[PDB]
């Protein structure tokens, strides 16, 4: 099926009121390294909750 | 002599789009839709210059009817009594007195009840 | 072109004789 009238630029923007992205509320700070990371994720060099889990 | 329609067409399109300011949607953006909107708005303005003289009289009647009934007389009997007393005050003025000078609108009602008597 | 085979198919097109 296809439209009978051209939907306006307000109906288009109302449909997109639910299309926004949500920012990450906070980043946890590592216990020893002191660097931010996603919560429950290892940091960018392999520290997770103090210990170094990936010595790479 | 070849004549190009460019400068002149733009002036005449921009005239109609200038009168269509405040209209929702394509009626203030698109010439085709805005031309019909400006024409239909000129028919309403002509028709409503006649109704402005009716809507306002209808309002003046209804404020005299309400102020007169506070003095114990209806509109139809109050207007008759002023013709019998040869008072030629306007309905636009009578409805004005009813709001701003309630002691002068009273004095008019005694004048009308007397002649109606 | 012209088709839109269902605008050529004459069972679909020639439905009201």
């Amino acid at each position: 099926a296809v439209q009978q009238n051209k939907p306006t630029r307000s109906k288009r923007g109302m449909r997109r009121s639910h299309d926004a992205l949500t920012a990450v509320t906070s980043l946890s700070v590592d216990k020893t390294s002191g660097e931010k990371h996603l919560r429950h994720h290892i940091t960018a060099d392999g520290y997770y909750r103090g210990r170094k889990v990936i010595a790479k | 002599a070849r004549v190009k329609r460019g400068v002149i067409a733009r002036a005449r399109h921009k005239k109609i789009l200038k009168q269509a300011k405040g209209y929702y949607g394509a009626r203030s953006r698109v010439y085709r839709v805005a031309f019909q909107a400006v024409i239909k708005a000129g028919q309403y303005a002509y028709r409503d210059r006649r109704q402005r003289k009716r809507q306002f009289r209808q309002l003046w009647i209804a404020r005299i009817n309400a102020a007169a009934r506070q003095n114990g007389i209806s509109y139809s009997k109050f207007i008759n009594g002023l013709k019998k007393a040869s008072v030629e005050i306007d309905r636009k003025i009578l409805a004005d007195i009813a709001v701003f000078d309630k002691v002068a609108f009273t004095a008019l009602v005694e004048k009308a009840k007397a002649a109606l008597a | 072109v012209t088709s839109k085979w269902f605008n050529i198919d004459n069972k679909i097109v020639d439905h009201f004789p």
């Binding site: - | 306002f56 309002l59 003046w60 209804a62 404020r63 309400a66 102020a67 009934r69 506070q70 636009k92 409805a95 004005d96 009813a98 709001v99 701003f100 309630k102 | -």
Partner: protein
């Protein structure tokens, strides 16, 4: 000079209380609608609500003439198909005494967001007592 227009933020509204015992249903509802709308004031403006607040007491003792007591029927539709429901005047006074007066006054007011604002100034009670003693309602033999 232009005609005076009442301003929504400076209109004076007052509280009245009406007893509805033995009044005729429709011949009372027209006086309610007249004052709910403001037609009794020299400041009446069509697009402003200049009316008064009205309390109606004893709503279950209102009266109808003729055989309307058992023959007046109130229909409404629920939206679902086949949902046409009716009640007589007898049955609504039994169940919803206040609804009978409010239906009558509501059909006599203007339709639209201003006529719905007039209807909010009508307080209707089935009994004889009301909680608005703080508003100091005056008595109306209307």
């Amino acid at each position: 000079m232009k005609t005076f227009t009442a301003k929504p933020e400076t209109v004076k509204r007052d509280w009245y209380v009406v007893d509805a015992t033995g009044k005729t249903l429709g011949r009372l509802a027209t006086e309610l609608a007249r004052r709910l709308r403001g037609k009794h004031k020299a400041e009446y403006t069509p697009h402003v609500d200049t009316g008064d607040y009205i309390i109606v007491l004893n709503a279950d003792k209102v009266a109808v003439t003729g055989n309307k007591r058992t023959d007046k029927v109130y229909y409404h539709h629920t939206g679902h198909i086949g949902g046409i429901k009716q009640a007589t005047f007898e049955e609504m006074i039994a169940r919803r005494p206040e609804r009978v007066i409010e239906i009558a006054v509501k059909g006599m007011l203007p339709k639209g967001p201003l006529g719905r604002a007039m209807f909010r100034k009508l307080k209707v009670y089935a009994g004889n007592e009301h909680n608005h003693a703080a508003q100091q309602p005056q008595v109306l033999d209307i």
